């Protein structure tokens, strides 16, 4: 979550928000769509998206993917050891795996 917030913050700091306030939710939707596309392993290319914005989203997606992989391969190994875990945690970890 923090990662997303950070990225969002950066964009809204350099977005001329006094002229382009309406695009905050658009940016967040683009972030979510890129994350979903990477998660589904499908090609993602917004044609009209600016190149610096695309680089921003790509770096954010790379960081989120690294965190996601590490979290999956940490929770799975914790569960294998017999650790006490919740039920939704197991479902989320199974989906990630």
């Amino acid at each position: 979550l923090e990662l997303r917030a950070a990225v969002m913050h950066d964009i809204l700091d350099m977005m001329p928000e006094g002229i382009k306030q309406n695009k905050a939710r658009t940016i967040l939707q683009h972030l979510s769509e890129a994350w979903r596309c990477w998660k589904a392993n499908i090609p993602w290319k917004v044609p009209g998206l600016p190149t610096p914005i695309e680089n921003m989203i790509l770096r954010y997606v790379k960081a989120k993917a690294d965190w996601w992989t590490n979290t999956a391969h940490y929770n799975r190994e914790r569960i294998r050891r017999g650790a006490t875990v919740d039920k939704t945690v197991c479902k989320k970890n199974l989906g990630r795996l």
Partner: peptide, 15 residues
Amino acid sequence: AEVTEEEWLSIPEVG
């Protein structure tokens, strides 16, 4: 910072 205001205007709504 190098992105122009027109390029900001051109970002499409996510479908």
